[PDB]
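Job type: complex structure
Entries:
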Amino acid sequence: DVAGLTPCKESKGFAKREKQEIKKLESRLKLYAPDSAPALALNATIEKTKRRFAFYGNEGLLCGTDGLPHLIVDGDQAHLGEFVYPGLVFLYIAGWIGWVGRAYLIDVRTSKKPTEKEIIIDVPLALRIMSKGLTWPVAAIGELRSGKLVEKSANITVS
Amino acid sequence: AHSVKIYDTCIGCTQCVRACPTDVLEMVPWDGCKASQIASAPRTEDCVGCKRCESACPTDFLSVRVYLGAETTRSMGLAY
Amino acid sequence: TPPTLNADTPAPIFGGSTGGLLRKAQVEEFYVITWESPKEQIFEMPTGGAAIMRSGPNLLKLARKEQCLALGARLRTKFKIQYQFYRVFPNGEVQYLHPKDGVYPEKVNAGRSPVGVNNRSIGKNANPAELKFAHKQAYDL
Amino acid sequence: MTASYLPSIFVPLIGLVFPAITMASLFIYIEQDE
Amino acid sequence: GARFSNYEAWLSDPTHIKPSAQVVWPIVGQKILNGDVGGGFQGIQITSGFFQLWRASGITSELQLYTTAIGGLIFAALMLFA
Amino acid sequence: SISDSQIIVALVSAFITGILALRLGKSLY
Amino acid sequence: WDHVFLGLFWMYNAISVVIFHFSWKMQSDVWGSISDQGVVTHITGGNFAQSSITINGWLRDFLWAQASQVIQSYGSSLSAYG
Amino acid sequence: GPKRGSIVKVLRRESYWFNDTGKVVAVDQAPGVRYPVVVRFDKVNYAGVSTNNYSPDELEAA
Amino acid sequence: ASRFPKFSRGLSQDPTTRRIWFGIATAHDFESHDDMTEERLYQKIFASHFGQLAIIFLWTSGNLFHVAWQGNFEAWGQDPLHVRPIAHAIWDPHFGQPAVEAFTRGGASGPVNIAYSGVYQWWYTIGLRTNQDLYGGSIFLLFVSALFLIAGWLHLQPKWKPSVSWFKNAESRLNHHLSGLFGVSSLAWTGHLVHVAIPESRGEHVRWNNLLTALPHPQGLGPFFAGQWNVYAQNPDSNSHLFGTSEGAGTAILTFLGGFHPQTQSLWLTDMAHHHLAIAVIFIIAGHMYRTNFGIGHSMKEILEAHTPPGGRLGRGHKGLYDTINNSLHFQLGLALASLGVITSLVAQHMYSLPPYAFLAQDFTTQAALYTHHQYIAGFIMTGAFAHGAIFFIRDYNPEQNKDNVLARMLEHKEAIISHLSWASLFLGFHTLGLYVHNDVMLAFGTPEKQILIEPVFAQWIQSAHGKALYGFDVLLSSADSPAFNAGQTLWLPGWLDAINNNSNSLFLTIGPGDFLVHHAIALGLHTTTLILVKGALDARGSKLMPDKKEFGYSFPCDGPGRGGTCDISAWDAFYLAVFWMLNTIGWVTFYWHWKHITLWQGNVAQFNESSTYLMGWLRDYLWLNSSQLINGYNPFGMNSLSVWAWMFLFGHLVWATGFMFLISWRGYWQELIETLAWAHERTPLANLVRWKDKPVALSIVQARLVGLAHFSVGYIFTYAAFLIASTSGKFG
Ligand SMILES: CCCCCCCCCCCCCCCCCC(=O)OC[C@H](CO[C@@H]1O[C@H](CO[C@H]2O[C@H](CO)[C@H](O)[C@H](O)[C@H]2O)[C@H](O)[C@H](O)[C@H]1O)OC(=O)CCCCCCCCCCCCCCCCC
Ligand code: CLA
Ligand code: CLA
Ligand code: CLA
Ligand SMILES: CC1=C(/C=C/C(C)=C/C=C/C(C)=C/C=C/C=C(C)/C=C/C=C(C)/C=C/C2=C(C)CCCC2(C)C)C(C)(C)CCC1
Ligand SMILES: CC1=C(/C=C/C(C)=C/C=C/C(C)=C/C=C/C=C(C)/C=C/C=C(C)/C=C/C2=C(C)CCCC2(C)C)C(C)(C)CCC1
Ligand SMILES: CC1=C(/C=C/C(C)=C/C=C/C(C)=C/C=C/C=C(C)/C=C/C=C(C)/C=C/C2=C(C)CCCC2(C)C)C(C)(C)CCC1
Ligand SMILES: CC1=C(C/C=C(\C)CCC[C@H](C)CCC[C@H](C)CCCC(C)C)C(=O)c2ccccc2C1=O
């Protein structure tokens, strides 16, 4: 459809990309007995290959003129499962990491030896902050609105 | 031939003259910091550019500054 | 103070070395250092190797000024020995350098003039873009 | 090539003689105290 | 060499069996690193020369490897103790 | 320059241009 | 310390040249597979005596030629080397 | 100048601690001192020192 | 002034060998000389400009003369597809008989070189058909170079020196440049294209002897002065026109056809004439804008001053930005270099898509050379622009005059700019490398269907909006109902849509997942290079590590080992670091272009379209595969025409490797080595009769960096020029 790519469950080049690999695996397989560890491993590999090729066609990815999936990172509603759906969860996880790290730094900074608490972590406080870091957007936006997110008296100097 | 300068922030640590391996920097009476001492570079014709002086002054930025200028035989550190 | 005068004091015992004087010493300046010792020790030469200094007076000629100052600092620190060194020209014109007024440059001394002292903080010099087509650099002012 | 005897005259006079004389002239100009 | 090696199979035909004493877990498609080395085995082909050393030492059974492994471990602890 | 005299013309013109460049360089120094 | 820093690179250079020498000379004039009647054909074909006298020979007959196994090892048991 | 133990912020344009805070230690009250205020900071500079002296007109924010 | 450098005393009194080196280095820095004033400097710039023009024209005349004397231009004119253009002849007394037999190809009687500079097609297009024309051009260029030398000497004599206040007349200079140097020159070129080029393309000879006789239009100059201008676009050449003959040629001189000539596969000459006429009129009209001395016209200072938006969003606006650009030569040099380096990449990107010369795009080994050449030139120029911006900031910027304008607020918030450039470069590099390594692992494990292939939907949509009908987007130029389509339907779209929808030329080649990744690598390269250069130019006046950098100058080695270590701190060192990234970016771009076009010319585009999405494909299908005739340029079985390249190639490597020698090892080792070498020379008999004047010393620090960078760059350029010429010309696509 879009970008001149056909869906993968109709691509006549995907069939070859499957059957050639299957036949290679079977050529490897025919060097043992059907009741030996190499044969079991190879049959498992073949079943995994079939299960993989019978999922891309059902998902809705568009293959190319060479029989290979192509990702439409465009915003297309028929393809949200390629970029934006995993991208949102990644952004969630990364904001989580950053927010809990920032909060740990903020809390440690007001102590006796803050430099000591950075080579020797204090696991109770760090764990508390990691736990509380689940609702980080509702906290980051709240700190932005309340004017608590940024400083103004930065210590940069240039003569 | 390099140009040494001593700005009026020396607290008289005397380390600049202790470190210079050419007898270039010397102490001088100058009231104003704590002990009426200051550095002075009368023999700049012998500085090679070692910058051992600047690596010793414990001032905010610095109080003794070496500016590398025209090159000669003494300043190049040659022995041949 | 009257600068000390050179003499023909003996030299430390040394079997030779390949890090001695070169042709620079006969067409240009060269240096010579003296000191006084109470016994006969073994001291490391700033040119490689060891030598046994002699009791009383000793005189040693080197090729640079930094060599003399290095050896003299080592003496004053390890052996507690005071010293001077001069610079000699091709035409035999001795010039007295290191203890210029007797007191080493660390201890303060009266009758010393300040050279290269600026009456301002280092971060106050004018930019190098106003003093263009005018050979004052930034700091000689 | 019309002449065809000039390339046998010039590259010996431009890759051998020209540097040989300009390097000598520039060495006399460099190593002089005026 | 005792547990994940085709040593006993190598001993029966040292000229057609490639040495191998390392196998890889099948997780992300890396299973293909376990190449067909011969003797009914599948693993990376080693080049340490340990099979030749064991053949020259007289070692002829995986058991005779197991024991010495344990032996080494003992010495390890011993060394640490010292 | 398929002819013969034309090469001589080019040579003498290059020589004149060389003298001009020589004078300019002398003036620049 | 800086002299040791500078000598590490020249040691690397020397040992790399030694191992290249050994590899090519062995594949060219020592190893091979003999057939009946005595005929022995080395791996590369005895091209070390004639092609190793020019840097271009070390570029194509050793690097370009012998590097043709690792580059196209994808999809095989020798993939980790590639 | 300022009081002892007072938290002041630097204004020296060529200072490592520019726009940073520090507590005064002891300001010398001699007649001819050009930089009497002594302030110690809780972060060393590129050289490793944390104490420095300024003039009273060169640093004040409270 | 009594030694080699007479413009400096510091180098004169230098007894060491360094006096020589730093005499050749600081030979063109007229600003930092002895006893320099603002009126000697400008006149020296003027005379050096005249000398440079003289050298350029002498080079062009030499090219003309050598193609006319030894080349086979006439033969190439009548068969531009089955003959090779000769550059010049070679006479090497070291050659051997097989080399003479190898290099004697073409039509020449001896050994010669083959011109990969494309001058043959250029000269043939504009209407040169005989060695006599080339010789006439050569002698005329000798004449104009002599005239430029005459003027350069003249304007240094005391009577005729211009004043410093004459140079700073920016209004009149810009007025005259814009009007004359652009519009009148384009008008003269239009006249030549109309009179000599287009008729010679139609078939009829037109030269000086019959200029005033043969008119370029059956009804010349009548319709022009009567406003009936369409008469000059009545009947153009058809698809059957043979370039050179009159077999199916029209009579129109100006038109707008678009697309390529079906035979030569290049743009229409009449189109170039029309374009030059249009831009000539545009430039002539745009000339009369600034007040010179006639009452009307603008004051280019009050224009700058008047553009401070109310609200203080960017401070005092552009107030004062006139004096800075006028008095400082480095500001003008940086602006000139940037604006020149953008268009010298524009020409590279355009000349390959729309070949402007007859029978180009069929010399598969010439277009590659042209593109690579111009892109490397553009890279060097873009680096020089930032270098001179940094020099301006160091030694020409006055923080008091530039009080709170935009130029000061750029220094006010430079930390944010550097931080965001850092973030962009890190992001791009992380993700590009991640995707490439993921595809590499996926191809390594035998499962090519698990790699992240991303279709470049934005660029494909743009191409569809230009009329391409491959992706079926049908937007704004593939749509038959869009007003943009109906507007240009009568004028040029019949040719433009025809050329762009033919998948055999370089006009908007198709793109897939393999182009996406390379474009992102190019973005990463650009971003990192600008990051280095901008960091240098901004922290060239001072940073927290060294807040007096303006007092030390542009290039200084370091500030000692103290304060943790301040090696490699100056702005010249920022430029020296950025040169590497510039070379790397240009190498990526040229690799991409060359592989794409090799695969297009061979016939299997589906090899690039499928083997570029991973990284071993680049190393095996492009570098290792296309090097089979290069290294075989000579062998124990003989040699062939590529042998020279097979030499040069290796040569490159050597030089390149030698660069490392100057970048890894530093001075303190080499000086301590020279100090004993001098001893060994002094303490030997029969060899102490000789004696050096300049004391031998090791190269300086910045000098070592410079020599290392020069070696690296020369090797990088040579080992790729050799490869791109040998792998292509050895196959010709
Ligand atoms: C087109 C080429 C045509 C053919 C050329 C072939 C000729 C062979 C080349 C000769 C090179 C000589 C050796 C290198 C130069 C010496 C290095 C050096 O001294 O280097 C240091 C120089 C001189 O330093 C100057 O040093 C000065 C020292 O002051 C001296 O000078 C002052 C007045 O000048 C005062 O007198 C002062 O007292 C006195 O000490 C100051 O420090 C100045 O600030 C400082 O600029 O530095 C500078 O700025 C560097 C100046 C050059 C900058 C150009 C760099 C461009 C590099 C681009 C990369 C090359 C890539 C090649 C690509 C090719 C692809 C095929
Ligand atoms: C810059 C232009 C240029 C260049 C690079 C060359 C290059 C070459 N010419 Mg040449 N030539 C030129 C212009 C040029 N020519 C012009 C304008 C003429 C007409 C007078 C000639 C006439 C000519 C003849 C008759 C012959 C050559 C030959 C050669 C080759 C051997 C070198 C030699 O003997 O030169 C000799 C050069 C001259 C006798 C005249 C020099 C021409 C101008 C004045 C030099 C340009 C100055 C230059 C721009 C400044 C360089 C600065 C630089 C050092 C930094 C070489 C490929 C020879 C050949 O074919 O060998 C195979 C040969 O026999 N040339
Ligand atoms: C009509 C009047 C006129 C004209 C024609 C010129 C022309 C020129 N002046 Mg000038 N000048 C003028 C009036 C004029 N000036 C006045 C009134 C003043 C008083 C203020 C000055 C003050 C002045 C100074 C101070 C300087 C000049 C300089 C120059 C030269 C610029 C360098 C050059 O040749 O670039 C040539 C550029 C072009 C031809 C423009 C091409 C357009 C772009 C950049 C390239 C596009 C090329 C195209 C796409 C493809 C062609 C390539 C082909 C191989 C296919 C040029 C000859 C400079 C010089 O050379 O010094 C001697 C210089 O330093 N002028
Ligand atoms: C021992 C190796 C060797 C040597 C010495 C030569 C020598 C020569 N070859 Mg050659 N060649 C060789 C191997 C060699 N070849 C091999 C193996 C091949 C491959 C089979 C070739 C292929 C070949 C071709 C295809 C050509 C040559 C040509 C030439 C001649 C160039 C002369 C010239 O233009 O001078 C001028 C020299 C230069 C311009 C280069 C110097 C530039 C310097 C390094 C940079 C600038 C210097 C700087 C400004 C400071 C110095 C200034 C100075 C004045 C003091 C010369 C006779 C050419 C020829 O015959 O034309 C006449 C030619 O076209 N050769
Ligand atoms: C939609 C879409 C799209 C687009 C996109 C875009 C265009 C974007 C933009 C964006 C932007 C333009 C951005 C902005 C920026 C930002 C800012 C300005 C801010 C910053 C941030 C912050 C501040 C953060 C914070 C944080 C957090 C939150 C967490 C932790 C960490 C931190 C702390 C960092 C596309 C086509 C792709 C696809 C489809 C969809
Ligand atoms: C002459 C004589 C004598 C002597 C004898 C002798 C001298 C003996 C010796 C003996 C000996 C000298 C012995 C020894 C032994 C040893 C052994 C028995 C060992 C073993 C070992 C092992 C078993 C090992 C193992 C291992 C390995 C291999 C590796 C891993 C680890 C381990 C360690 C485990 C006498 C007096 C009697 C008598 C008279 C005569
Ligand atoms: C540091 C410095 C400097 C330098 C700077 C630089 C070197 C820059 C560069 C820059 C650059 C080099 C930039 C560029 C830009 C570009 C642009 C901005 C473009 C735009 C474009 C456009 C606007 C387009 C549009 C369009 C389209 C897209 C389509 C259709 C057509 C049209 C046209 C509509 C200076 C000397 C100044 C000053 C001092 C400091
Ligand atoms: C080799 C080396 C030397 C010593 C190298 C020397 C003394 C250079 C001299 C080489 C010979 C004598 C000249 C070579 C001639 C060239 C082919 C061209 C000369 C320049 C043209 C203008 C003629 C250094 O001093 C050095 C300093 C800092 C970092 C790295 C190094 C470094 O690598």
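Summary: The longest strand of chain H covers residues 21-24. Chain H touches chain B through 15 residues (CB under 8 Å).
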